[PDB]
Amino acid sequence: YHIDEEVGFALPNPQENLPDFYNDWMFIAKHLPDLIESGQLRERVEKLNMLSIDHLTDHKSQRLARLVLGCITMAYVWGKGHGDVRKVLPRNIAVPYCQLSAALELPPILVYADCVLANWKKKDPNKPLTYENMDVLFSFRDGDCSKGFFLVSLLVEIAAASAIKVIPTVFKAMQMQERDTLLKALLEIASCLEKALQVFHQIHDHVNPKAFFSVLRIYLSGWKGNPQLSDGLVYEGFWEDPKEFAGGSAGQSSVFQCFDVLLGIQQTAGGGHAAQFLQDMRRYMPPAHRNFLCSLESNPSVREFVLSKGDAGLREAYDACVKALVSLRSYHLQIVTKYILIPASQAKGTGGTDLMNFLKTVRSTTEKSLLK
């Protein structure tokens, strides 16, 4: 399922340099701030040779190439970020990008798995995974707080990895009827989820709201229900008609969904808009991680097991997990207020109110699953 013990859904030790064959791509991606500002970004993209993807032969080089092409694509479409957009992606980016995206089974737009899960390095390999020892590989504009937003997102993923590695213990304990082992597992998950909540606080240290809202959000925006590209984007030379794809959001994280699925909280049940969105966002996750979520829904229910045993210790450990999720969602809502709602007050579903209502629906659905 391509889940790492240490960093979870994050790509371990991402690749940083492509083969020299792709130098022309890497130069543009590494210089987005200068090229966007000077107005050379679009000219440089339009001057690119067509580069075959046949020199990208392992998962790490393909993932780096997707991140490179994805950042180039956002810079090309959105430009300087003030409404002068391009609705046609030139063939010499669109064709290799779409081919690579098909091989990796991801849509041809920058997604969370590119610009967070694969967009990072350790400064010192001998030091731990702390903010001070980490950097991103690509940013869009000087002052866009991309390092802070991407790395804090990644730090939440790494924190969650401590809980994700316990999930097999949970199902093995239910299968083997190991009550004490299951109780310890559920409590360990809840403890890790509250430590993940502590990581959330780091966003205030590294991301300021004006920069995030007015700059970074622009470059992460997509072309699904977006009035600036109402029919989607033309991937020139690959598909004739434009296609719509959503921009990035926290709902693309597998961490956002996997614990609800583990605990039997049915966030994708029904035809409601929140459910449909979370189902649709699975298409924006790496296929192995989609598969992991699907396997969790097919396993015997943790929730029915705990409810069937007349075990107040099991129910409370389960409830500790649920409350931890509820806290996480509530802090998530505070982030929406500080980083979106308030900056806005001075694309369909992108509106801060729609984002707010979505998280409130999710948090309510989580609260409903409390046993007592």
Ligand X SMILES: Cc1ccc(NC(=O)Nc2cc([C@H]3C[C@H]3C(=O)O)ccc2N(CC(C)C)C2CCCCC2)cc1
Q: Which of the residues 253 through 292 are near ligand X (CB under 6 A)?
A: 253, 255-256
Interatomic CA distance for residues 217 and 347, integer angstroms: 12
Interatomic CA distance for residues 114 and 138, integer angstroms: 10
Cβ closest to ligand X, residue 187 vs residue 250? 250
Is 138 a binder of ligand X (CB under 6 A)? no
- Count other Cβ atoms within 10 Å, centred on residue 322: 24
Is 326 a binder of ligand X (CB under 6 A)? no
- Residue 31 assigned ligand-binding role: no
Could you tell me the smallest distance in angstroms from the CB atom of residue 236 to ligand X?
Answer: 23
Helix axes 254-262, 287-298, angle to 10 degrees: 10
Interatomic CA distance for residues 233 and 230, integer angstroms: 9
Cβ closest to ligand X, residue 18 vs residue 325? 325
Residue 230 near residue 224 (C-beta atoms within 8 A): no
Binding part of the chain for ligand X, among 152-160, 295-303, 307-315, 362-370 by CB under 6 A, reads: 152-160
Interatomic CA distance for residues 188 and 165, integer angstroms: 10
Which one of residues 11, 29, 69, 156 is an interface residue with ligand X (CB under 6 A)? 156
> Cα separations (Å) of 145 from 142, 158, 213, 252?
8, 20, 10, 20
Which one of residues 15, 226, 249, 369 is an interface residue with ligand X (CB under 6 A)? 249
Is 344 a binder of ligand X (CB under 6 A)? no
**Secondary structure (3-state) at 205:** helix
Is 89 a binder of ligand X (CB under 6 A)? no
Beta bridge partner(s), residue 89: 235
Which one of residues 104, 187, 215, 250 is an interface residue with ligand X (CB under 6 A)? 250
Q: Which residue do the tokens 């709602």 mark?
A: 341
Beta bridge partner(s), residue 22: none
Is 36 a binder of ligand X (CB under 6 A)? no
Is 245 a binder of ligand X (CB under 6 A)? no
Least Cα distance to 111 among 275, 254, 242 occurs for 254
Is 101 a binder of ligand X (CB under 6 A)? no
Could you tell me the smallest distance in angstroms from the CB atom of residue 366 to ligand X?
Answer: 13
Is 41 a binder of ligand X (CB under 6 A)? no
Cβ closest to ligand X, residue 307 vs residue 356? 356
Is 115 a binder of ligand X (CB under 6 A)? yes
For 242, residues 6+ apart whose C-beta sits below 8 A from its C-beta are 87, 223, 229, 231, 232, 233, 234, 235
Q: Which residue do the tokens 């007015």 mark?
A: 214
Binding part of the chain for ligand X, among 9-17, 132-140, 178-186, 243-251 by CB under 6 A, reads: 243-251
Is 333 a binder of ligand X (CB under 6 A)? no
Residue ranges binding ligand X (CB under 6 A): 110-112, 115-116, 152-153, 156-157, 200, 203, 220, 248-250, 252-253, 255-256, 332, 335-336, 339-340, 355
Q: Please give the annotated binding residues for heme b, written as ranges.
A: 332
